[PDB]
Structure formats: structure tokens, C-alpha cells
Design a protein around this ligand. Sequence first.
Ligand SMILES: O=C(O)[C@H]1CCCCN1Cc1ccccc1
Lengths: 237, 300
Amino acid sequence: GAMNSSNYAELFNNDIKLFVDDTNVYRVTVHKTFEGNVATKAINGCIFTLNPKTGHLFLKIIHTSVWAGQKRLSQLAKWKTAEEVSALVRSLPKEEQPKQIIVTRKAMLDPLEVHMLDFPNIAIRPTELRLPFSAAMSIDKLSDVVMKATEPQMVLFNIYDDWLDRISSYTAFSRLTLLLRALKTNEESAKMILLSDPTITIKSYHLWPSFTDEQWITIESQMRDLILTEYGRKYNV
Amino acid sequence: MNTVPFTSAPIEVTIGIDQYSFNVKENQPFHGIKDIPIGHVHVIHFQHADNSSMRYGYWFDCRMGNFYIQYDPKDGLYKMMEERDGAKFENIVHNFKERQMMVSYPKIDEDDTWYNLTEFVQMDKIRKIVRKDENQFSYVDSSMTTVQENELSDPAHSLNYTVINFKSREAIRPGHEMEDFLDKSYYLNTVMLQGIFKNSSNYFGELQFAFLNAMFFGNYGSSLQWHAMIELICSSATVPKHMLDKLDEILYYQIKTLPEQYSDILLNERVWNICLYSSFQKNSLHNTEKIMENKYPELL
Ligand SMILES: O=C(O)[C@H]1CCCCN1Cc1ccccc1
């Protein structure tokens, strides 16, 4: 059934699973027209498909051309997401195919189930967790590849960098969700925290800075402070 | 007009005949039902006074044989049987009529209700849904499961309705996933009508039979089937005009006949609100929408 806090360690067992987040598939800016009406302009988006045990991120870039001449784009985007996830699964060798796909939004359940009818043994599940994957577009290297794309493109990343050489998947996922939650709550301040020390750099082959174990503890505390600080600003606490 | 005689009525029972019903007392001198209209299927059904568990009954057509009811004290129910000796049967009926030991099928001349509920229902199609080839009549009861219910346990005692599943490979063409899920016209017109049922009359016959088994026996799987067959049409953008007009008539008479006090258990809120107010056919069922809004405005 649905994935929640009760069965949370299941994310880090040896059954291959993927999270699918569709928040950033259909992206738009709203502008006034010369006549004073409102119109949208679609911008490039992406599907965020993540293996939480290994950190492998399958980032399918959604180029604005896929919306041309189509209607009901917010509905279409869920079906396009499901089409692309289905295509990804079929492209993987059998022993790499997931046993479960967890969608971050319940509106993805029927589109994905229908696209995956050929895989009756892959469970399609929602989650009670509020995960901050919408903030993926706040990771500079991910935003850059999405915005530069001139055609549909799949790009592969490890969203944990080399962390699994030193920490467990459970701890890596906790750090990722803390970083993303901070970037979602106050992007400017989160990026300030991450880069305020020019001596710690981001390797060319990485997404996040090369913090030592002690520095990650400090960074993580600063992110928790930021989240708490913003919570107090929001609710006047 | 035809007759279904009863050997006797040893146990107190409510007897239904089509949309009518009457109470028979324990050992009352009751010997059957006369003046049954020729030309339609009929259903004769039972609910025991001492155990309302299991409504059960028999679908039959008097043009196919001479049928009678006889209580079986071992199996504890009223059973339908065929009498092959025609002269014996005519004699029995004539004597029971002469002694006035029979109730008359109480059809009002103006009243087309039974025709309107059974217009497309054929005994030959009933016998394919309810498999028991050695009899010309078909037994149905409250507890019988459908072939689909069993997939999700005795198959010889099942209701073999046509399986309808909106999230199945049968319903969804590879490469048309969104199209086929949001518009069921392919599944209705090509798969079901052209492919399985052959024509709309057979589709409507199964729909009508499912409704009647739901209403007369409280058969839950039949209710599921009835609603699935409605939703399949209403969720198709492309339906022949003559089917939509006929569906409105079929549903209108079904809603008209349903007991007001059984609405809570025989009508699915989701399906009806979807069909009348959100679906492609939300504006094609004028007669059905009007009776539903006036009779069951709570459900909506
Ligand atoms: O569409 C998105 O997901 C992103 C893309 C980046 C810019 C806008 N926002 C949403 C947004 C829509 C309409 C008005 C204001 C904001």
C-alpha cells in the first residue's frame, strides 16, 4: 500500500525501487498579453526518478516542444510522465527493473498503473511522506542541464555524490531530504550556507560540495536552523 | 397464458413472480401461479419466512417447457422441475384452476413495466451466464459470485457475466494509454460491442439481467456488473445515438421500479454522480436524470 513513516526502512532494503516526482514536468511563467489578457509560456522541465538506496537519478528532461499543440497540459503531463517512466523501465535489463515505483503525488497512480499494465508484478504505490523533490531545480547543475536542453534528453546523476563510501543509504537519504527541504524553504540562504566557504568546492563530477564528515554535521545543523528560522518567520513564533 | 403449478407449500415463504410478491403460510392450500404472460422471460423467487438468508429463484420461459415447483425437504428449498408428460401436466393445471388454488399473475393492462425491464433479456443468453445445461431454467441466489469476483470459489455455481475492467490490457491499447483510459469508446465499441456481444441488444440484455438479479436477490456481484456496464457507456465519447436513447429508457424503468427503501444498497453514488454530471454522456440521459433527481436527490 502507501509508503509512510511506519515502513520507512523499506526504502533501503535490497528490493529495487524508484521514487517518481512529476512536480517539475510541466513548468510555466505567466505574463500579460498586449491586449491585457494573461497567457502562459512553458519552460523546459524534468521527471525526477530516484533510486533511494543507490542515489541513481534518472533525470528525463522535458523539452517545451512536447507541449506544442496539445491541450489540457497539466493532465497530459501526468500521462507523459507515466509514458517516460514506463519507457525507462523497459530500457533497463530485467535484473535492474524496479519491484516497486513510489509516486510522490497520488494523481500519478492511474496514469502509471495504466502505462505499466505489461508489468503486473511491479507495485505502484503512493506515499504519506511529504518529500521535497520539487526543489531538485534548486541544484545548480540539474537546473543548468534542464534549461540548456534543445531536445528531449535523459541525464544520469548520482544525487548522493560519493557519500555512500562513508555513510549508509538511510543517512544519505536523510541528508538529501534535509538539503532539499532547506532549498525549498529558503533557497537563497540554503545556497549561502552551502557555498559560504570558498575553500570547499564542488568537484566537476559532483552536485554538492566536498565536505568532510565534521563539516557535514555543521552544514546539517545550519540547514535545520534555517528551516526552524523560516518556520518562525512564517507563523510569527 | 401459461402456468407454473406447485405440488404444495409446506414451509411459510414469500413468493416473488417478476416484480410482484405475496406471502404463503405454512401448509396453506397453494398450488401455483396462472395467467403468466407469454413472450417474456420470467423469474419466480423465494424468501423463507423462518430464514430470510438466501433469496433464491429461477429464470424461465414457459414457451420452452412445462415447469412446476416442488419443495425438497432434504435440500430445504422450493425447486423448479420440468414435466415432460404434457398430458399429465395439462390435467394437473386444469384441476388446480378448477379448484381455484392458484394466484393470477396480476398484470394491469396499461402496465408495460415487465416488458420494459426485460426488453433485451433472452433465455438463451441467461443460460450462458448461468451454466447448468441439463435444465431449461436457471437458478440464481443471493450468494452466487461472478467470474470476476472469483478472480480477485466454486466455478460451477458462478455468474459468468462478461468481465469489464477499466485497468486491463483488454481495455487499453498499447500506445493509446491516455486516450483509451479517458475515453472508453475503443473498449465499448470495438472490444465489447463488435468483439464480444456482437450487438447492442445482447449488451443491454446482460445489463438488464444484472440489474434484475441485483434487485430481486440482493446479489452484490450483479450490482457491480450493472454499474460497470452503465459506466462503460457513459465514459465513452462516441456512442451510437440509438444506444444512448435506449439506455436512457432502460435506466429510467430500472430506477422507477427499484424499492425506495433499497436505494442505499443498490445504487453506487460514485458511478451515478459521475455518469449523470461529469461523464461524456452527462447530458444524454434526460429521462434517467429527471427520475433520479426527483426520487433519490440524497444520493446526489
Ligand atoms: O511552473 C512552475 O513550476 C515554476 C517554473 C518557474 C517559474 C514559475 N513556477 C510556477 C509558477 C506558475 C505560474 C505563476 C507563478 C509561478
